[PDB]
Amino acid sequence: TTLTLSEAAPLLKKEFREGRLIPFLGAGFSKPLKLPDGSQLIASLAKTLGFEPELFDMHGRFEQLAEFFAISAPNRLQRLVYEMSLSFDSAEAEALREKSPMHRALAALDWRTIYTTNYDKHVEGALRDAGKQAAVLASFADFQGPRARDVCEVIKFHGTLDQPDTIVLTESSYFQRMALDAPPDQRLRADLLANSFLFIGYSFSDTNIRYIWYRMNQLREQSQLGVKHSQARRCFFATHGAGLVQPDILQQWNIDVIQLDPTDKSASVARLLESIA
Amino acid sequence: TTLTLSEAAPLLKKEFREGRLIPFLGAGFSKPLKLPDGSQLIASLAKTLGFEPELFDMHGRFEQLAEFFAISAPNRLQRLVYEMSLSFDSAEAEALREKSPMHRALAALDWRTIYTTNYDKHVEGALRDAGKQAAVLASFADFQGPRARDVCEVIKFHGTLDQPDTIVLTESSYFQRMALDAPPDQRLRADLLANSFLFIGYSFSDTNIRYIWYRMNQLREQSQLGVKHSQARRCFFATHGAGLVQPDILQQWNIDVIQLDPTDKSASVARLLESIA
Amino acid sequence: TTLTLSEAAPLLKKEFREGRLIPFLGAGFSKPLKLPDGSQLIASLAKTLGFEPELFDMHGRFEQLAEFFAISAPNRLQRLVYEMSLSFDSAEAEALREKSPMHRALAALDWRTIYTTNYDKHVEGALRDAGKQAAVLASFADFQGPRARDVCEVIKFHGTLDQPDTIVLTESSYFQRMALDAPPDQRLRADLLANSFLFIGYSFSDTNIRYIWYRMNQLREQSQLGVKHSQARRCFFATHGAGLVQPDILQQWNIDVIQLDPTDKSASVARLLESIA
Amino acid sequence: TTLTLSEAAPLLKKEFREGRLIPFLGAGFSKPLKLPDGSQLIASLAKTLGFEPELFDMHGRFEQLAEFFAISAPNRLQRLVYEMSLSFDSAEAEALREKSPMHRALAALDWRTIYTTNYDKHVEGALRDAGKQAAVLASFADFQGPRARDVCEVIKFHGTLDQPDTIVLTESSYFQRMALDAPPDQRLRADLLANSFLFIGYSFSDTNIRYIWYRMNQLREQSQLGVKHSQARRCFFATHGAGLVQPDILQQWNIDVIQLDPTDKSASVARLLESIA
Amino acid sequence: TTLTLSEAAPLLKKEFREGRLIPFLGAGFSKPLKLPDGSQLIASLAKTLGFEPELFDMHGRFEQLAEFFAISAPNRLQRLVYEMSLSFDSAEAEALREKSPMHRALAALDWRTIYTTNYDKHVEGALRDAGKQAAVLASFADFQGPRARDVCEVIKFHGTLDQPDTIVLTESSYFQRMALDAPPDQRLRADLLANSFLFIGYSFSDTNIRYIWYRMNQLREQSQLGVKHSQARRCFFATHGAGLVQPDILQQWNIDVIQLDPTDKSASVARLLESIA
Amino acid sequence: TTLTLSEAAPLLKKEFREGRLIPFLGAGFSKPLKLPDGSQLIASLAKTLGFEPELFDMHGRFEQLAEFFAISAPNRLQRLVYEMSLSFDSAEAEALREKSPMHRALAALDWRTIYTTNYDKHVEGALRDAGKQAAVLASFADFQGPRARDVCEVIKFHGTLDQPDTIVLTESSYFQRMALDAPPDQRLRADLLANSFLFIGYSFSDTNIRYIWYRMNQLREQSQLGVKHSQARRCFFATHGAGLVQPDILQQWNIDVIQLDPTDKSASVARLLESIA
Amino acid sequence: TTLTLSEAAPLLKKEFREGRLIPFLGAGFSKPLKLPDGSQLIASLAKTLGFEPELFDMHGRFEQLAEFFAISAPNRLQRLVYEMSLSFDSAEAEALREKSPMHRALAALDWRTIYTTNYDKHVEGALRDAGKQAAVLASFADFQGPRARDVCEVIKFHGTLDQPDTIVLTESSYFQRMALDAPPDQRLRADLLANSFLFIGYSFSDTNIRYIWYRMNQLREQSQLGVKHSQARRCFFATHGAGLVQPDILQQWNIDVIQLDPTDKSASVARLLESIA
C-alpha cells in the first residue's frame, strides 16, 4: 500500500494540470539549508537560568520548553524568535537556497497555493529566485491586502519571522490551533473542499500533523453528510522511510504514501517535483 | 513551586469539607493490581498477522497500533477488548484490590463524583468493598437511569469494559474526544465550573491529559469573559517525580503539583488520601 | 398529539418521584405579578433621543432596540437595567408573589434544579416564602461558592438583576448565547443527559426558545452517536393555546405539548403543578 | 475664625448674584431621607461568608470591607450596589424628599452647577420637584450628550446608581481618584478657576474630602505661578460642630467655616440656603 | 479619507445647532491682517548683539532664539513683546480686520467658546465689530472675574499681549505647557469631555499642535477606561493642502481633515464658516 | 492566606542571596528604644496656647495638630522638631540600641538599601555598631555626594532630624508626598522595578503606608502595560496581629503577610531577620 | 561658553573617579558601523503601497511615516523592525565594531551604567569584546532578573531589537514617552539625583533629546524645592559643531558643550573617552 516514484508521477500530474495540487511543506524541506535546530538555540539560552544545555533538554519537548520561557522569562522567548530570524534567514541560507535542487524544482512549477509550516522565508524566496512573484499570507492584514491573480499565494501556516506575533511555537499556541480558528486555518477549511494536498517533509511521529491529517478527513466527511457519498481527490505524503503500519493508517485519512529513495534525501524529493512538470 | 504532603493536606481538606473535590484517576492508580500492559496484549495478537512482538511495537504508539487493527483486521480489535476484560477484571485483580491501601483510602471518604480514565472496574469495586454504593456512568443510557443522591457517581471518562462501544482506545477515537462531545465530556464541562480536581496516576509525557489540562483552563477563562475576573478553585496533581520545568507550566493551567515520596509509590498515595480524612 | 391535564399528570409524577424533572420557566410565569413590559420602559427612555414612544417601537424588536442603546447611548442601557430592578423586584411585586397560586404550587415541591429565563427574583423568592432555601446561579462566582446538597439550585439562564453584567438582553448577547458557552449553558449541557424538562410560560413564536429546543435535541442525538440508540426521557411544554401544526414539530424535538385550560391562565398552571405532588 | 449664619449670608449672596457659587453636597445632606447606612448593608451580606455582622465591621473601614468583596466574592459587591439602588432611591425616600426643607431650599435657587458625592438621585429629584430641569453628569457619555444652557448640571462626583460602573466605593477606587483623572475630576479642574464652593454635609474626619480640599488649593496656587499672586474667591464649609483647631487649618485651604445651629440639623441648613435667596 | 467643503458642512452644522462646536484658531487665521513675522522682528533685535539678521536665524528655531534672549539679554525679550504689541494690534491691522471675510464670518455665529493660540486681539475684536460681547480669558484673574452667560468666552491659549507674563513664546515655556497645568489648559481638560473642535490655521509640521492633538485623544480614552467604550464627537481640521499620509494619522486622533480650495486661502475659510450658519 | 515564620524564611532567603530584598522600616521598629510618643510632646507644647493636654489631643490627629502649629504658631513647630532631636537621638536611646536584638539582627546582614520612615538615627546607628558603614540619604545634597559601592544606603523616606527641612510631619506635607516628587520618592520609583520589599513595623490602620502599598502596585502594573504581563517579585509585611480581612487585600497589592508570634514583639522580629542569614 | 578637549578632560576625570559619570549615547555613536538609515528602509517598504521612495519621504518625518505604517498597514511596521534587526546587528556591523576606536575606548573604562537610545546591540557588544560583562535593561522582566554588582548595566532607553515590543519608533510612542512612565524612564528619574551625564552622538535639532534635556533640569530643580538650593553636578554634551546660540541655551539646562575636532569625527570622540582614563 505504498506508491513509488514512477507510480505516483501520473497521479500527481493529473492533479496539477487541472490546478488542484497544493504542496504542504514541512521542516524536512528546509533540511539542505543547514539551519540551526532551534532545540539547540533554546538550550543555549537556558545557560542564563542556570541550566546545562543537555540538562535543560531533558525536561520536556521543544514546545514545552518554549512554554517555560513564555511564562517564567518572557524576554528570553523574544530572544529566541530574534536569533532564529538572524539564523534561519541569513545570507548563508540564501546562498544554499540558490543551488538547492529541491527549491529549484518547486519554483519551476506554476503553483496557485503553497502551504508551509516552517518559519523561514525560503519557500517564497525560491519563487523569487525563479523570477516569479509570491504573496506571503500569515496574518489578517496579509489577506486584506491587494494582489493579482497570477501571484502564487504562500500561506505561512505557523507564522512568519517578520511578523513575530504570528509564530506558533509555544505549546499552548499549538493546542489553541487545534480548534482551527486562525486565518491560515480558515483558508485551509475552504481549500480542502476542492484540492489535493502533497505533504513533503514530515515524520510519522510528529503528532501535530497527524491531528491535521485526521481533522482534514473529518471535514471532508462532514461536508457530505446529507448528500450521497462521492469520492474525493486523494492526498499524498512523500516519505523516505514509510515503515509498515503507518501507511495503512494514512489510507483511511485520504492520504497515499509515496516511498522515495532514501540514499539521497534531497535528490529524490527533487525527482518527485520534476516528474510533475 | 511544588507542594509536599503536609503542605497540600490542609488545602485538600478545605476543598473536601465543602464537597468540591473530585478525584481524576489515571492508569497509575491501577498499578498495584498487577494488570497486563495492553501493549503486551496487542503485540501477542500481532503474531497471527506475521509480526514478531518486538517488531510490531516498533511501528508506532499503542493507540496507533490499535488504529491498525481497527481498519485492517477488525476481529482482532474486538479480541483485544475481550481479553482485557478477562485480564483487567479477573478474580486475581479483585483479591489485590481488597488489600490495596490506595483503594481502601479512596473508599474511606464520602465522595460525590469520581472521574477515571482506565477501563477496569476497580474504582467502583473499591467502593463496593467498603460497603458503599457506586453508579457507573459511561454511556447515554447510564445517565438516563435513576439513582439516589447518596450514591457516588463514578464517571468512566474513556469507557467501561462491560460496554465495549464506549471504549476510547483507537487513535481516531482519541482525536474525536478532543472536541469534547461525549457524555463524559459534557459532564466535565459543568463540573469544572464548581469543583477542584485531584489528578492521580498520570505522567507529564502523556499528551492526552495535557490537552485536557489545557482545555479545562480555557473553559474556566471563557466562562468569565464578560464579568470581572474572579479567582477559581485550584486543582491538584499528585506526582512521585515532579521534575523542574513541568510544575511551572501546570501553575498556569490552574494545577498545583504535589510531590509524593518516590521510595514507595503505593504508600505515599495512600498517605495523601488519608490526610484528606 | 396533545396531552391534557389528567393525561400528563401521571407522566410528570413518574419523572418527579425519581428526581428527574426540571422546570424551565419563562416570562409567562411572571405574568400574575403585574410587572412592566420592558418594551414600554425602553420606549419612554427614547424620549430623550427625540423619539415618540409609538415611533421608537416601530423600528425593530425589543432586543434590537436594546442593541441601539448598547452602541449609540450606553448610559441609557444601564438606565434600563436600573429601572427594571426597581420595577420587577419591587415590594408590590413581592406582595402579589405571596398570594400567587402558581408560585405557591411551585414551591410546594422539593425540586433539585429550576431553570428560568426571566431576570426578576420571584422564582427564588417563591421558595423563600415556603421556608425553603434556594441558591441563585448566574455567574462563574456563583457556581464556585459553597452550598448544601439539600438546597434547590435556581439557575438564572439569562442573568439576574443583582449581577447586571450577566443580563442577556441585547441582540448581540442573544446571538452569542447560541454557541452555548456561558456557565448556565454548560450546566444545561450536563443536565439534558439525565433529566426531563418542563417548559412553562413560552410562546411558539419566540425564536429563541425554539433554537434551545432544537439544540437540546441535537445534543441528545449526538451523545448516542456510536452506541445503539436508546429512548430518552420525554420533555414537556405546558401551553394554553397549542394550535394545530406546532405540537407536531415539537414531538420531533422530544417535547410533548400539554394543553391547559385557557379560561383562567394562572389557575390552570397551578393545577398542573399540584398534580405533580 | 468662624462665620455665623448672619455673617456668611451677605458673603454667599454676593457670590450667587454673579453666578459663581457651586454647592458641593455630602452624605449629611441625605440625612433626613432616613436611608440605610451601607455599612449595615455590607455587614448583612457578610453572613453568607460566615461573619457575624458586628465581627465583620471590626476588620476595617467601609471602603476596605468593600475592597474585600471586590476581590474575594465579586457577586456580593454587585449585590451591594443592587440593594443600595432599591433602598436609597425607594418610594419612601422620595416622599421624605418632597417635604424636606433642605431639598426645597436647594431647589428654590437657580443654580448653574451642583456637585454631590452621594450615589442617590435626590439632588436632581429635588430640582424635578420644583419644576426645574436637571442634567446628571457621571460618565463620559453623559458629558457628550446635548442639553440646553438653562439646565442646571448636576455632576455626580462619585458615580450614580443607574450607572453602576461609575460608583466609587471600593478602597482602590478611592485611591485612583486621587490622581484626578475621572470626567467629574476634569470638570472640577476647570470650575475651581472661576467659582467658589459651598461644602455642605461633611465631617472633619473624612480624610477623602480633606485631600480634595488640599488639592483644590494646590491647583489654585499652581494656576498663578508665573503671574502676580491675585486674591481668589473664598470657599465655604457649613458645619454644626466646628471645633477649635480644624477651622484654622481650613483657612489656609481657602475655605471659611460657617457655624450652624446644632439644635436642629436640618432646619439650620435650610435657613442657610434661604438666606442666599 | 478627506472631507470636502460640501461634505463637512452638514457635519459642522449638526455640532453647532446643539452648541458643541469650538473653534481653535491658529496663526494662519491672522494671515490676511498683514502682520510682521516675529522671526523678522527677533532678527532685527539681534543687530545690537552683533548678528546679521540672516545669520541669527540660522542658529535655531524661533522659540529657541527667544530662549537665547530670555537668558542672555532679558531686556531684548521684553523689547520683542513690546514691539509685537505695537505691530500686531496696530490701527492698520484693525482696518484690515474690519473688511476681512474670515473675521466677519467668524463673528456672524453665536459661539460659546473660542480658542486661539495667537497673541493678537483680532479674535475678540472681530466679535466687537459685529456688536457682540467677548470675554478674554488668559490668566487666573480673568477666570475669577464676573461675566454674563450670553458672552462668548475667548480663551487665549498662549497668552495675550496686554498681559505680557502670560505669553508662551520661549522654548522652555512651550515645554512646560506640555504638562497642561496652565489655566487655559485646565479649561481645555473639561471642554474636551463635551465638545468637538474645529482647528483652523495650522500646518502639519508644527509639532506643538501635534502634541495637543495627541494629548486630547489620550484624555478622551482615559476618561472612559472603566466604562464601556462609547463613540466621541469628531473633531475637525480645515486645511488647504492636506497631503497624503498626514490625514490618515489624524483619523486616529479623532480629527477629520477638511480640504479647502487652495486657490484663494481667505475665501475658502470664509465659505466654511458661512456654511455652518 | 498568611505565612508563618518557617514558611516565609526560605522565601526571604531566596530574595536576599540575589540582593533583591529591601527592608522598609516603620515606627514599630523603634519601639524597644522607649522613645517619647510625639503626640505627648505636641500636647505639652500646647499648654502655652491655653490647652489642657487631653483636650488638645481631642481636636484631631497628630499630623493635623502639627498643621495647626505650622500656621498659627510656627515657633512651636520648630520647638517640636528640636525636642524630638534631643529625645529620639539621646544617649539613653543609643544604649538600648546597643542591646536590642532587632537592631543587631538587622545589622548582621549585608544590605544594599534600607528604607525607613522614622526620623531617628537608629537605623544607621545599628549599622555603625556592627562596624559597618552607612550613608544617610534624605535631601538632594545627600544623593549628590560621593560614596563607595560597599556602603549600605539608608534612605530616610520622611526626613532626618539633622536636616529639619526634610521632615514630613505636617498634614500638608503628607498630602504633597502623595504625588511622589521628593528625592526619596524618585529613588523608590526605580527600586520597585527590580526589588522586593520587607515592610516591618506598621499597622493596617495607618492610611499613609496603605497609599504607598497601593501606589507601588500601580507603578508595577504601569511599567508593563504594552509588553506581556510577567510575574513580579513578591513583597512582604511582617505583623504580630494579621486579622482576617486585611491580609486578603494586601495579596492584590503584591504583598504577603507574615504572622509573627505576638507574645514577645521584639523577639519574633529578631527571629525573622536571623532566618534570612 | 564651550569647553575644548583638554579643558573638559579633568572635569570628566573627576566625575569618573568617584563613579558618577554615565554616558548617554545617541545615533551618532553608531555612525562608523555603516548601518542603513532606516528612513531608506521605510521608503523601500512603501513601494508595495504605490509610493516612489523619494515621494514617500516627502510626506513627513521618519517617526510620522512609521505612524502611518502602525495604523494603515501594521504588517509592514513589523517588517521594518525585522529588517532592521538583520541590518543593524549583522555580522558585517560586528566586524566594524571590533576595530572601531570609539567602541574600544568606551569599553576600556569600568562604567557602572550606560544609557543609549539606539536599537542595535553594539553598546553591549563593545563591552563583550573587551572581555567585560554587560546587562541589557529594556523591559520590566530585565530589571527583575538577577545580576552581579560588578556588571555594567546598559539601559536601552528606546528599546532593543530582540524585544520588539519595547521599540520606541512610532510618533505616538515618542509622545507617550514624554510622560516618563517607562521602566527606562523610572531608572532615569533616580540616576539624575546622583550622577552627571555625558551626551555623545546627538544634534541640536533633534527635539526629542531637547525635551529630555529640559525635563532632567526640571526634575533637579523640583528635587530641591523646599531645601536650600545646592549646586548640582554638571552634565556634558560632546559635539563636533557647536554653533553660537545653542551652547548658551544648554548652560541653563545644566549641560556644558564640549567642542571636538570636526576633521575626523570618530577619532575626536575616541580621544575624549581615552582622556577619561
TrEMBL record, chains A, B, C, D, E, F, G:
> Which SUPFAM superfamilies does the UniProt record give?
DHS-like NAD/FAD-binding domain (SSF52467)
Protein's recorded name: NAD-dependent protein deacetylase
Q: Which organism is it from?
A: Archangium gephyra
- Tell me the lineage of the source organism: Bacteria, Pseudomonadati, Myxococcota, Myxococcia, Myxococcales
